[PDB]
């Protein structure tokens, strides 16, 4: 008080000193149920693939791509990534996901990698240098053990032109060893650009169905359309916290109310265009919003000449969120309530006044 008044001797009265404010302790994050899951189930166990070189591309759109099912299963065999860090895929949003898939054998899994080129570098699907993604190749010898050795996934081999990143090697050009073109069926040094499958289950361990679903990522200037789910904290009530709802962000308490919103109504606003009500994202409960307790601090002093003890008056604040006596204008901490009525000496508010009487102590 002496610092604010710039003096050493003050007289009787109530002086304004400062303005206190309660700070939020913790923060609460609330998000609704995780719905609209990305249909990644039909990518692994589904119908057969078209061909090796004729692989099908499946783009990704607005969905919830949960990664808690990819690196948490045992049906697969290879999960080697190339700088993806699957432990943090839930907190990373991408825009372009390439769900390439084709059929290979057990010995061709090694030849398909950005660090090991060769047979699959210019004859089939090639991998780029960066290749932000993980290879998903599992042993498909569960029910792909048909008799006769059906050769339908004929992969194109001995091709001259190198294959481009994320492309297909579709070219009906016969293999020419460096002579006149035959333009027929295996003429003068001619070979049809097709190789015969037929890796029967009684052929070998390396020659088995190993359908691989290549997965990669790519970032662009477009907004994030595909990303993993989010987390959610526990609900707290009757405490000045910082709520972090899906559409709302601010501070204030979160108590219960008797208001009833419409099925589609989610937010809540008052006449002064201020947020005062919020709906719970997970459950169905209208949570009231009320700003935390604030206000200025006032002191009641009887003058430094008589004595030096003073009191405090937190105006407009309840005595729980801060001897103590709840008045109609705050909580006068540092004074006793006497039933005897006297003349008003120091005005406080709503009729209550203070004075320095008898042992000497501030009375209200």
């Amino acid at each position: 008080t002496k610092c604010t008044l710039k003096s050493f001797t003050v007289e009787k009265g109530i002086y304004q000193t400062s303005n206190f404010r309660v700070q939020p302790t913790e923060s609460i994050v609330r998000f609704p149920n995780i719905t609209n899951l990305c249909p990644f189930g039909e990518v692994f166990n589904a119908t057969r693939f078209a061909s090796v070189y004729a692989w099908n591309r499946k783009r990704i759109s607005n969905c919830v791509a949960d990664y808690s099912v990819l690196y948490n299963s045992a049906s697969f065999s290879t999960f080697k990534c190339y700088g993806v860090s699957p432990t943090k895929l839930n907190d990373l949003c991408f825009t372009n996901v390439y769900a390439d898939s084709f059929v290979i054998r057990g010995d061709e899994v090694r030849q398909i990698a950005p660090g090991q080129t060769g047979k699959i570098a210019d004859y089939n699907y090639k991998l780029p240098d960066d290749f932000t993604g993980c290879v998903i190749a599992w042993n498909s010898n569960n029910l792909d053990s048909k008799v006769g050795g059906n050769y339908n996934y004929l992969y194109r081999l001995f091709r001259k032109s190198n294959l481009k990143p994320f492309e297909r090697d579709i070219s009906t050009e016969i293999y020419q060893a460096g002579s006149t073109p035959c333009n027929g069926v295996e003429g003068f040094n001619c070979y049809f650009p097709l190789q015969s499958y037929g890796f029967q289950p009684t052929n070998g361990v390396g020659y088995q169905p190993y359908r691989v679903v290549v997965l990669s990522f790519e970032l662009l200037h477009a907004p994030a359309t595909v990303c993993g789910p989010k987390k959610s904290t526990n609900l707290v009530k009757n405490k000045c916290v910082n709520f972090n709802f899906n559409g709302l962000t601010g501070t204030g308490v979160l108590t219960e109310s008797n208001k009833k919103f419409l099925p589609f109504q989610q937010f809540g606003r008052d006449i002064a265009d201020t947020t005062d009500a919020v709906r719970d994202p997970q459950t169905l409960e209208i949570l009231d919003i009320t700003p935390c307790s604030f206000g200025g601090v006032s002191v009641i002093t009887p003058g430094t000449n008589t004595s030096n003890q003073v009191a405090v008056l937190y105006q407009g604040v309840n005595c729980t969120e801060v001897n103590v006596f709840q008045t109609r204008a705050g909580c006068l901490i540092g004074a006793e309530h006497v039933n005897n009525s006297y003349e008003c000496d120091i005005p406080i508010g709503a009729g209550i006044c203070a004075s320095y009487q008898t042992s000497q102590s501030i009375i209200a």
Partner: antibody
Framework: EVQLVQSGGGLVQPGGSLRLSCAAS????????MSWVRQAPGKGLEWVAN????????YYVDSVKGRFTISRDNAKNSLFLQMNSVRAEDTAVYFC????????????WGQGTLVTVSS | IVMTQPHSVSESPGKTVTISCTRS????????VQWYQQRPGSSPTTVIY?????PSGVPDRFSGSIDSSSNSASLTISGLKTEDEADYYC???????????FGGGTELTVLS
């Protein structure tokens, strides 16, 4: 923050066995796999068996396939490993460690159980 | 399937000496490679996992690379001091029958 403990055996004998219990606490024991790894005196590490979330699948190795029973109660957050017909080469210290993900390492290991067979 | 590893190795505080771990079947670039450290008289701990990267807490001196020449791996442990004299193991998921194969161990010590 994660501090795992395990006990439930100080001495065994051929024929009569016990059940090792690994108390899971600290972290969230509802989204991680579990597996046992034993260590023989003067040797390296050996993978004993694995276990699913609650009751999905119980993967065993071909060495102890038929004489070891693993279990996991997701309700009380505990890991039980009961033995039966202990052989002679089973003299090794068993360790309890949670699995971050099926294609990753183990985050926190246990403390070790001195389980030895001696006449 | 078995994971080969040198039995013992010793040197003086100075340059780094990597530890090799050569496989026997399959490919090394098909799964991750982890390196554990077991202090004598306590429980093992993970030092480096996904050798292309490194976790927090452990100093950046412990490095490792991938050698796809003959399905092997290397753990270039730099900064040989007294607080690093311990044992190390090799581990890599190779078994298609849901089996985790481990290494043999090492005896990396110092010269004092």
């Amino acid at each position: 923050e994660v501090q795992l403990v395990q006990s439930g055996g100080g001495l065994v004998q051929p024929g009569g066995s016990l059940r090792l219990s690994c108390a899971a606490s600290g972290f969230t024991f509802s989204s991680y796999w579990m597996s046992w790894v034993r260590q023989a005196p003067g040797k390296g590490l050996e993978w004993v068996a694995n276990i699913n979330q609650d009751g999905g699948e119980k993967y065993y190795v071909d060495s102890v396939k038929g004489r070891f029973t693993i279990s996991r109660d997701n309700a009380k957050n505990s890991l039980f490993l009961q033995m039966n017909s202990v052989r002679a080469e089973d003299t090794a210290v068993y360790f309890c460690a949670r699995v971050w993900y099926y294609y990753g390492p183990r985050d926190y290991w246990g403390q070790g159980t001195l389980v030895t067979v001696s006449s | 399937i078995v994971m080969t590893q040198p039995h013992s190795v010793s040197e003086s505080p100075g340059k780094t000496v990597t530890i090799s771990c050569t496989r026997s079947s399959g490919s090394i670039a098909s799964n991750y490679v982890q390196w554990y450290q077991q202090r004598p008289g306590s429980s093992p701990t993970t030092v480096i996992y996904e050798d292309n990267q490194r976790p927090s807490g452990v100093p950046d001196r412990f490095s490792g690379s991938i050698d796809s020449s003959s399905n092997s791996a290397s753990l270039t442990i730099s900064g040989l001091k007294t607080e690093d004299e311990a044992d190390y193991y090799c581990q890599s998921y190779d078994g298609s029958n849901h089996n985790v194969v481990f290494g043999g161990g090492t005896e990396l010590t110092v010269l004092s």
